[PDB]
């Protein structure tokens, strides 16, 4: 259940959370556009569920893709702020959850992101403790959908 | 249309935008559940969109109203980081649009926000001045619709 998984978030996950999302949050339009194109990259067959973004090849180019990128990030936003206290990151999480259960995205095809994410974090160098705190937020909201 | 609405952001709105943000945009969660209720008390018709809220006179305590009112105010912190940059803010404003649009929300409903927004404002003792500002940044959302 989501309220299960948001007791995961142990206090050194939320501190490396934090501290990578410092550097990470600094630059939402290329961070989220990078982790999207990475997305589509990587798992193709998620295209189809962003069919009115248009020519998703085109990156930053696309206003669509570039919308929806920076947007992204302030749910990523909104999370991390919300970690101090529980009943709200649930409710958030909850709220969030709503228009991706109705797109029919599972829990499944949601994980897909932490690939990308991974990248994301490594390429501004941090490693594998960074991306495994950031797959066990991710899967609060996998316990959501 | 939503780039000329965004023309009428000025140097000295956006200034008053950013200066009544700090203060408003510090505590998401009270201000954001205080406009909310607001709309609901002052236009209660509006309460027909959020039948999945459930009830919503419990304010604060209603966890969904709770969540969504949180989120509502990253919506607002995302338009005001991109305030500097049409381009982008042009390009989260009709992100931003695509689920209004489909609830049926019209640019006239959607205005009904900006009492609760002036009210709330006058709470940390911003003036008319301020809501004006407000409600031309409003008005660009409102542009999209
Ligand atoms: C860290 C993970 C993700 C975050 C933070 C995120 C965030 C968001 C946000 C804030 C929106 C706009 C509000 C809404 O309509 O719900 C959105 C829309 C959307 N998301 Fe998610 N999302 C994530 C991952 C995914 C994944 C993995 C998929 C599909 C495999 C997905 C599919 C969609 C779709 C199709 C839309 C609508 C796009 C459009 O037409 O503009 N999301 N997401
Ligand atoms: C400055 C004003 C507003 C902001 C910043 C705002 C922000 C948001 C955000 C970020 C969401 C979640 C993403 C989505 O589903 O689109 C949302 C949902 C929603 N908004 Fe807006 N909104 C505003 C005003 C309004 C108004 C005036 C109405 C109707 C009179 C409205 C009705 C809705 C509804 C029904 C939902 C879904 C609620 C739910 O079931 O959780 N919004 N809005």
Same mark, same amino acid.
């Given at each position: ?68 990128? #920076?947007?992204?990030?302030? =749910?990523?936003? %909104? *999370?991390? $702020?919300?970690?101090? &206290? ?6 958030? @999480? ?22 990308? #994410?991974?990248?994301?974090? =490594?390429?501004? %160098? *941090?490693? $594998?403790?960074?991306? &495994? ?6 899967? @609060? ?5």
């Amino acid at each position: 259940s989501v309220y299960d998984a948001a007791a995961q978030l142990t206090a050194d996950v939320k501190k490396d959370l934090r501290d990578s999302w410092k550097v990470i949050g600094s630059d939402k339009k290329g961070n989220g556009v990078a982790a999207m194109t990475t997305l589509f990259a990587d798992n193709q067959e998620t295209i189809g569920y962003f069919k009115r973004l248009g020519d998703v090849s085109q990156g930053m180019a696309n206003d669509k893709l570039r919308g929806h990128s #920076i947007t992204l990030m302030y =749910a990523l936003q %909104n *999370f991390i $702020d919300q970690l101090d &206290n529980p009943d709200d990151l649930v409710c958030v @999480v909850e709220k969030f959850a709503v228009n991706h259960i109705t797109r029919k995205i599972s829990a499944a095809e949601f994980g897909k992101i932490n690939g990308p #994410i991974k990248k994301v974090l =490594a390429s501004k %160098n *941090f490693g $594998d403790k960074y991306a &495994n705190a950031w797959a066990k937020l991710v899967a @609060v909201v996998q316990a959501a959908l």
